[PDB]
Design a protein around this ligand. Structure first.
Ligand code: HEM
Length: 153
């Protein structure tokens, strides 16, 4: 469980994410796609994009980056009590999108990278630690839904 201390750190950097969701959402998906190319193959919708410059020029990709960060933001502000929000999310990812839990680990890593680039003084070791925990709790609750459905672990 995150402490109320750790959540404060989490929601304090998230409030600045919210200052430019689109921006952050674009950087995050691009990092994920470049670092883990197989992840791009899960999107029929963005599969055509070949270069970083193309990804950057895609307004539709920018639009999906807000969709994603918007769903994450709502979960995070629930501080742990996110079951209604998480559920539909795990359902669609396991069963429609077929996204392995491992791929959820790579986007976490992408998020924590971008946050670090964008908000140094706001994302020290301590907040990095808190965000990592929040995303592990995310991963863990989603995993328990996947196993219940007969996907991944
Ligand atoms: C922070 C983790 C993530 C969050 C909060 C998130 C959120 C969303 C949401 C809200 C949607 C639209 C509604 C729905 O279908 O659920 C969506 C669509 C989707 N997500 Fe995620 N997602 C996450 C991670 C991933 C990852 C890692 C992948 C693949 C590598 C993935 C693949 C997709 C695909 C294929 C769609 C369908 C989009 C479309 O074609 O319109 N998601 N995601």
């Amino acid at each position: 469980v995150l402490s109320e201390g750790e959540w404060q750190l989490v929601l304090h950097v998230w409030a600045k994410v919210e200052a430019d969701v689109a921006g952050h959402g674009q950087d995050i998906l691009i990092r994920l796609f470049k670092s883990h190319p197989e992840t791009l193959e899960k999107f029929d919708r963005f599969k055509h994009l070949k270069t970083e410059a193309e990804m950057k020029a895609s307004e539709d990709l920018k639009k999906h980056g807000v969709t994603v960060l918007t769903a994450l933001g709502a979960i995070l502000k629930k501080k742990g009590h996110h079951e209604a929000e998480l559920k539909p999310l795990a359902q669609s990812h396991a069963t429609k999108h077929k996204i392995p839990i491992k791929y959820l680990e790579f986007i976490s890593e992408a998020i924590i990278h971008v946050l670090h680039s964008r908000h140094p003084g706001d994302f020290g070791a301590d907040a990095q630690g808190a965000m990592n925990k929040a995303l592990e709790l995310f991963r863990k609750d989603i995993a328990a839904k996947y196993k219940e459905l007969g996907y991944q672990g």
